[PDB]
Design a protein around this ligand. Structure first.
Ligand SMILES: [Zn+2]
Length: 866
C-alpha cells in the first residue's frame, strides 16, 4: 500500500458535471447504473482513471457505444481514447450484505445505508472519487416495497412509481454540485418524526428523523437540537439552510459518530436516541453537539468543500470550532472550555507524542481513514480558535463572510481559509500558517521578575517543539499567549508600557522574548495562557499559594479550574514517584484545604465546583510523565480520591444532600447541580464501607433518571463496594435488550479496578448483548479495556496485549476501520518501560505478519515499529 503526498496534488484531467444513478437494490446483489457527463480538462491523450474497489464490472459505454479501449487495474478502471465531452455509462454489481467493513453501501440490521468518507463511493461504482470533482446528482432507487418502504437519497423527491413483482421506485435530485463523499442512500422501514423549521428569511424546511420501528420515544431531543442548531447558525454566523428538506437517519451499525451527507445525514444512533431513563446528561449534551456539528457542515464542508483530503481540517477543525461555540453559547462556556481542554491535554497531546503524530494538515497519508483524528478535529479547532483570538469576533465573522463569498460552490484549501481571514481583517497570519504544517505540542516556558524600584513586571517567554517521528525540523510558532495580572486584593492590574495600554494577548513569535509591563504597583500573581489561548504545555514555577490564590480570585472560571489542575499535577507527580518506592500518599494539609474551600464556597457556580472536584482521568495523568507507569497512576488516583474522601467527608455529604433535585430537567442549572452532586458521590463511595454502600445502593434504586443511576453504578464498580454485583446484575436484567444502554455497562466492566477484569472482559465476548458485528459494542468492551483501562491493558504479564492481538486478528479482516481505532493503545509503546515495550513490539510484529493485513493497520504498525 502506497503513501500519497500533499505536494503531489494536481488538478484532475477530467471533471464530471452531472451524474444520474440508478440502484436496483437488493442486500445480496445490487446493480448500479451510473450515467456521467464528463469534460476533459487535461491533455487530449490523457486517459480517464476511475477509482473502484470490490466492484463487479458489467459494462462500459461512451455515448452509448460499447467501449473496447479500457483496462481494469488494481483499484481502477482506465479508459482511453476519449472525446473532449461525452456520456460515460457504467454498470456494475456490489453486495451490501457481504460488506462487513461498513464502507460504501452496506446492511445495517434490516436497513441499507451508506458511509462514503473519505473514499467509500468508489466501493459503490467506478468514479472520480476525489473531492475536487463536483457533480449534480440524481438518484433513482428501485427496491422491494415490503422490505424497503422508505427509499432516500440527497435532495428532493422528483419522481416515484410502482412496478410489478412488488417493487417501487423513487428518484431524488439535489441541485447543489457535490463531491461524491457527500452522496448518501438509505433504504428500510422506519418510524419518522416530522417537524418544521422556518428560516429567518421565511423558507420552510421539512425536518424528518428516521429511527428503527419502536424508537420514536427516543427522537424528540435530537429534533429539538436540530432546530436549536439551525436557529443558532442564523444568529451567530448568519447562515441559513439552503434546501427544502432536512433528513437524519439513525443507524445502529456505523463506524463513525455521524456524517454530513447533504440534506440526508446518517448518524450512529448513539448520537440520536435519548430518553431520561436510557441516557445521561452527557448523552443529551453529546447529541446536541453532534446534531449541531453535522448541521454546521452544511456550510463548512458542503457549500464549501475540500480540494483534497489533506485539507480535511478545513472542514473538521472549523466545524468542531462551530459545534463548541454552539454548545458554549447554549450552555456553560466555562464547562465546555474545560472539557475541550481536558480532551486536548489528555488525549490529543498523547497522539502528538506518538508515532502517528501529524500536522493538522498532513503531508503524507497511506490510509485516509486513519486521519479523522483528535489532531485534525480537536487541535484543528484550537487553531481556528487562535485565529478567533487574534482577530476578535467581528473580524473573524468578516473573514467567514469573505471565505464563503470567494469559495461558495467550490472545493477549497486550508490556505484559502487563512487568506480570507487575513484579507478581511488586515491581521498578518503568515507566521501563524506554520500551525498547519508543524506537528507536535509546543512547550512554552515562562520566567518572571518583579522590580520594586521601577515597578515593572517582566515575563521572559520561550518556546520549543520537540522533534517528532515525522519531522526532524521544528521552528517557532505564532503563539497567542493570554495573560492577566492580579494584585493582592484579587484586582486586575491594567497592562501597560511607556504610557500606552498593552493587549493582554501577547504575541509569542520568537524562540525567546521578553515582555515588560510598567506601572505594576504591587507584585502580581499572573494567570497565564488564559482560557488555554494556545494548544501548548506551560512550564512556569508556580508556588502552591499562587495557585490557591487563583482558585479563589481569578476572574474567568476556566483559570480557577486550571490553577487547580496545576496544583494537582505537582502532587500527582509526587505520589507516583512515591508509589514506585513503595510509599503511601502524601498531601500537604493546605492542598486538601483548597478543595474544602471550593466545596463550601457559596458564590462559586456549581458547574465550576463540579469540574474542580473531578480529578484528572488516568489518561490526563499519563501526560504529566515521560515514561508512563499506568499501575502507579491508577493506584495514586484511587489513593487521592480516598484521602480527599476522608479529609472532606462531612463537607462532601452536606453538598451531596444540598444539591438533591426531585425533578429531572435537561437544563444547564439543573445539570450543573447534578454534576456537582455526583462528583461528591464519587468521593463518598470511598468513605466508610457500610455508609458508602448504603448511599450508593440507595441512589441507584431511587434514581428517576439514567444520569443518577449510572453515577451510582459507576461508584459501586470504582470502589468495589459490596452492592456491586447485585446492581450490575439488576442493570443487565433490566437493559440487556438495549445495546446503547448496555454500552454503558460494558464500559464499566472494561474499566473496572477488580483484579479479575480481563477474565471478566473475555467472558463478556459471549454476553447476549455483545457482538463483534457491531462497532459500538466493540468500542464499549474491547476499546474501553485497551484505551481506558491502561493499568489492566498494561498488566505486567502482557495478557492485555495478547488479548488485543486476538481481537485485531478478527477485526483486521472484518472491519479494518474499527481495528485501526482499537490498535491505537499499542502504538504508544515508546512511552512505557523497556519490558513493556518489548512485549508490545512482539504484539505489533505478530500483527504485521497477518495474512491480508489491511492498509489501515499497516500504516500504524510500520510507524510504531520504526
Ligand atoms: Zn465533521
Amino acid at each position: 500500500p502506497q503513501a500519497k503526498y500533499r505536494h503531489d496534488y494536481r488538478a484532475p484531467d477530467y471533471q464530471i458535471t452531472d451524474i444520474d444513478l440508478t440502484f436496483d437494490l437488493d442486500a445480496q446483489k445490487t446493480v448500479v447504473t451510473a450515467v456521467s457527463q464528463a469534460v476533459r480538462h487535461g491533455a487530449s491523450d490523457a486517459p480517464l482513471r476511475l477509482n473502484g474497489e470490490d466492484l463487479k464490472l458489467v459494462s462500459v459505454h461512451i455515448n452509448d457505444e460499447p467501449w473496447t479501449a479500457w483496462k481494469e487495474e488494481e483499484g481502477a478502471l482506465v479508459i482511453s481514447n476519449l472525446p473532449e465531452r461525452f456520456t460515460l455509462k457504467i454498470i456494475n454489481e456490489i453486495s451490501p450484505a457481504a460488506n462487513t467493513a461498513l464502507e460504501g453501501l452496506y446492511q445495517s440490521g434490516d436497513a441499507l445505508c451508506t458511509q462514503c468518507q473519505a473514499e467509500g463511493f468508489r466501493h459503490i461504482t467506478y468514479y472520480l472519487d476525489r473531492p475536487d470533482v463536483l457533480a449534480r446528482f440524481t438518484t433513482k432507487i428501485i427496491a422491494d416495497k415490503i422490505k424497503y418502504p422508505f427509499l432516500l437519497s440527497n435532495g428532493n423527491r422528483v419522481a416515484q412509481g410502482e412496478l410489478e413483482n412488488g417493487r417501487h421506485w423513487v428518484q431524488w435530485q439535489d441541485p447543489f454540485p457535490k463531491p461524491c463523499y457527500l452522496f448518501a442512500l438509505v433504504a428500510g422501514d422506519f418510524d419518522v418524526l416530522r417537524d418544521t423549521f422556518t428560516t429567518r428569511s421565511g423558507r420552510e424546511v421539512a425536518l424528518e428523523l428516521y429511527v428503527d420501528r419502536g424508537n420514536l420515544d427516543r427522537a424528540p431531543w435530537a429534533m429539538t437540537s436540530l432546530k436549536n442548531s439551525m436557529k443558532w447558525d442564523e444568529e451567530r454566523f448568519g447562515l441559513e439552510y439552503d434546501l427544502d428538506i432536512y433528513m437524519i437517519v439513525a443507524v445502529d451499525f456505523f463506524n463513525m459518530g455521524a456524517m454530513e451527507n447533504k440534506g440526508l445525514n446518517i448518524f450512529n444512533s448513539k448520537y440520536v436516541l435519548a430518553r431520561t431513563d436510557t441516557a445521561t446528561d452527557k448523552d443529551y449534551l453529546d447529541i446536541e453537539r453532534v446534531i449541531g456539528h453535522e448541521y454546521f457542515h452544511n456550510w463548512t464542508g458542503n457549500r464549501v468543500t475540500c480540494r483534497d483530503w489533506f485539507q480535511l481540517s478545513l472542514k473538521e477543525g472549523l466545524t468542531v470550532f462551530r459545534d463548541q461555540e454552539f454548545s458554549s453559547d447554549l450552555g456553560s462556556r466555562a464547562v465546555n472550555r474545560i472539557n475541550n481542554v481536558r480532551t486536548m491535554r489528555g488525549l490529543q497531546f498523547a497522539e502528538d507524542a506518538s508515532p502517528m503524530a501529524h500536522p493538522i494538515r498532513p503531508d503524507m497519508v497511506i490510509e485516509m481513514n486513519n486521519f479523522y483524528t483528535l489532531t485534525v478535529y480537536e487541535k484543528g479547532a484550537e487553531v481556528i480558535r487562535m485565529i478567533h483570538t487574534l482577530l476578535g469576533e467581528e473580524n473573524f465573522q468578516k473573514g467567514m463572510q469573505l471565505y464563503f463569498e470567494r469559495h461558495d460552490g467550490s472545493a477549497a484549501t486550508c490556505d484559502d481559509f487563512v487568506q480570507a481571514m487575513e484579507d478581511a481583517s488586515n491581521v498578518d497570519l503568515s507566521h501563524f500558517r506554520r500551525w498547519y504544517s508543524q506537528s507536535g505540542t509546543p512547550i512554552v516556558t515562562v520566567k518572571d521578575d518583579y522590580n520594586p524600584e521601577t515597578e515593572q513586571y517582566t515575563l521572559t517567554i520561550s518556546q520549543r517543539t520537540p522533534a517528532t517521528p515525522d519531522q526532524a525540523e521544528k521552528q517557532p510558532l505564532h503563539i497567542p499567549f493570554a495573560i492577566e495580572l492580579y494584585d493582592n486584593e484579587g484586582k486586575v492590574i491594567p497592562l501597560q508600557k511607556g504610557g500606552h495600554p498593552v493587549n493582554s494577548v501577547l504575541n509569542v513569535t520568537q524562540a525567546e522574548q521578553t515582555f515588560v509591563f510598567d506601572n505594576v504597583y504591587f507584585q502580581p500573581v499572573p494567570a497565564l495562557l488564559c482560557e488555554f489561548s494556545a494548544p501548548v504545555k506551560l512550564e512556569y514555577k508556580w508556588s502552591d499559594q499562587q495557585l490557591t490564590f487563583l482558585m479563589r480570585h481569578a476572574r474567568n472560571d476556566f483559570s480557577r479550574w486550571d490553577a487547580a489542575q496545576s496544583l494537582l499535577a505537582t502532587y500527582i507527580k509526587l505520589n507516583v514517584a512515591r508509589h514506585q518506592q513503595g510509599q503511601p500518599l502524601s498531601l500537604p494539609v493546605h492542598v486538601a484545604d483548597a478543595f474544602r474551600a471550593v466545596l463550601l464556597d457559596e458564590k462559586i457556580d456549581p458547574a465550576l465546583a463540579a469540574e474542580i472536584l473531578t480529578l484528572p482521568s488516568v489518561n490526563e495523568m499519563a501526560e504529566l510523565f515521560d515514561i508512563i507507569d499506568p499501575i502507579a497512576i491508577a493506584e495514586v488516583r484511587e489513593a487521592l480520591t480516598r484521602t480527599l474522601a476522608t479529609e472532606l467527608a462531612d463537607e462532601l455529604l452536606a453538598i451531596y444532600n444540598a444539591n438533591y433535585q426531585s425533578e429531572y430537567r435537561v437544563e444547564h442549572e439543573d445539570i450543573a447541580k447534578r454534576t456537582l452532586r455526583n462528583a461528591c458521590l464519587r468521593f463518598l463511595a470511598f468513605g466508610e464501607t457500610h455508609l458508602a454502600d448504603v448511599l450508593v445502593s440507595k441512589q441507584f434504586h431511587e434514581a428517576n433518571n439514567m444520569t443518577d443511576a449510572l453515577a451510582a453504578l459507576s461508584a459501586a464498580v470504582a470502589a468495589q463496594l459490596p452492592c456491586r454485583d447485585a446492581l450490575m446484575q439488576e442493570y443487565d436484567d433490566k437493559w440487556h435488550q438495549n445495546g446503547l444502554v448496555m454500552d454503558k455497562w460494558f464500559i464499566l466492566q472494561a474499566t473496572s479496578p477488580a483484579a479479575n477484569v480481563l477474565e471478566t472482559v473475555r467472558g463478556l465476548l459471549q454476553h447476549r448483548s455483545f457482538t463483534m458485528s457491531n462497532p459500538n459494542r466493540i468500542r464499549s468492551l474491547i476499546g474501553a479495556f485497551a484505551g481506558s483501562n491502561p493499568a489492566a491493558f498494561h498488566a505486567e504479564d502482557g495478557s492485555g496485549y495478547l488479548f488485543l492481538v486476538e481481537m485485531l486478528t478478527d477485526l483486521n479482516s472484518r472491519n479494518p476501520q474499527v481495528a485501526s481505532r482499537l490498535i491505537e493503545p499499542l502504538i504508544r509503546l515508546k512511552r512505557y518501560d523497556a519490558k513493556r515495550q518489548e512485549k508490545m513490539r512482539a504484539a505489533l510484529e505478530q500483527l504485521k505478519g497477518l495474512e491480508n493485513l489491511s492498509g489501515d493497520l499497516y500504516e500504524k504498525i510500520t510507524k510504531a515499529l520504526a
